C-alpha cells in the first residue's frame, strides 16, 4: 500500500496472508468469507506466461495477522489448503478478466477478536454502493512505494472512479468484471495498492446496516500511485454467481 497508514488492531479481521511454504515468503493478500473459505485473485495462484501454477501443498494461509513478518503467537492462525478453485474463464492470456479464485481450508478456523469474515454484496448493496466518488478501503502488506516494506498491515481509503476515466487511463481492455479506484491528479490526495497487495480486499461499510462488504479484489495497476493511473479491482458481485456455485457444490 502506497500513501496509507498502519491499520488498527482488529481493523481488518478478514485479512488473509497467502504464504509460500518454501521459501517462506508473502505471496499475496486474500480475505476470509466464512469459517472455511478464502477469496483471493486468480493471478496469485496461476499465471502460465511466467510459469506460475501453485498447488494446494505449496501454500498456507495466515489469518488474524497484523505484523507482516512476525509469527504472532496466540493471535494468528495458520491453515492448510484443501482445494484451490480458479474461475474457469479467468483470462490470463489477455487482461486478467475475471481475476478471482477460492481456497477451501482443510479445517474451519476459529473466529476471534482478530479473525472474522467479511460479507459479500447482494445485488442491491452493489448497485447502491459501487458508484463513482464513493470511497472503499484497501489493505495489505505489499510495497510502500514503487520498487520498502511495511512492519504491519497498511490501510488506505480510495474513491471509485468513473468507468470512462478508468478506460482512458490505460491501453488495457477494461471489462465489466473490473472497476478502478484512486484519486485523480487534481484531487491532491494520493494512495494505491502495490506489489504484494494482490488478491487482498477492497471493502465498503454499508451505511444501511453498518456491515463491511467486499466489493473488489486487488487485481493490477500500472506502477503504483502514479498520477493519471488507477488501481484495478475484480468486480466481486459480477462474479458472485460463480462464488455461490463453488461453495454450494463443494
Amino acid at each position: 500500500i502506497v500513501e496509507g497508514s498502519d491499520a488498527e488492531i482488529g481493523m481488518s479481521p478478514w485479512q488473509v496472508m497467502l504464504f509460500r511454504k518454501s521459501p517462506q515468503e508473502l505471496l499475496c493478500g486474500a480475505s476470509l468469507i466464512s469459517d472455511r473459505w478464502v477469496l483471493t485473485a486468480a493471478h496469485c495462484l496461476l499465471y502460465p506466461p511466467w510459469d506460475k501454477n501453485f498447488t494446494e501443498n505449496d501454500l498456507l494461509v495466515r489469518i488474524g495477522k497484523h505484523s507482516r513478518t512476525r509469527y504472532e503467537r496466540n493471535i494468528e492462525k495458520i491453515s492448510m489448503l484443501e482445494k484451490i478453485y480458479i474461475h474457469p474463464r479467468y483470462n490470463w492470456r489477455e487482461n486478467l478478466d475475471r481475476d478471482i479464485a477460492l481456497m477451501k481450508l482443510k479445517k474451519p478456523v476459529a473466529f476471534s477478536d482478530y479473525i472474522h469474515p467479511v460479507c459479500l454484496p447482494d445485488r442491491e448493496t452493489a448497485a447502491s454502493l459501487l458508484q463513482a466518488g464513493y470511497k472503499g478501503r484497501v489493505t495489505g502488506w505489499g510495497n510502500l512505494k514503487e520498487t520498502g516494506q511495511p512492519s504491519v498491515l497498511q490501510v488506505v481509503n480510495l474513491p471509485i472512479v468513473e468507468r470512462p476515466v478508468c478506460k482512458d487511463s490505460t491501453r488495457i481492455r477494461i471489462t465489466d468484471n473490473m472497476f478502478c479506484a484512486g484519486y485523480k491528479p487534481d484531487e491532491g490526495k494520493r494512495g494505491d495498492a502495490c506489489e504484494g497487495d494482490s488478491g487482498g480486499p477492497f471493502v465498503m461499510k454499508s451505511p444501511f446496516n453498518n456491515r463491511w462488504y467486499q466489493m473488489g479484489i486487488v487485481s493490477w495497476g500500472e506502477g503504483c500511485d502514479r498520477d493519471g493511473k488507477y488501481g484495478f479491482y475484480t468486480h466481486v458481485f459480477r462474479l458472485k454467481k460463480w462464488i455461490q456455485k463453488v461453495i454450494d457444490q463443494f
Binding site: 504464504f19 511454504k21 518454501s22 517462506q24 515468503e25 508473502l26 498456507l60 495466515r62 513478518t69 512476525r70 509469527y71 495458520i78 492448510m80
Partner: peptide, 11 residues
C-alpha cells in the same frame, strides 16, 4: 526476513 513459523504447519 520472515520469522520462522512452527514446524507443525509445514509437515
Amino acid at each position: 526476513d520472515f520469522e520462522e513459523i512452527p514446524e507443525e504447519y509445514l509437515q
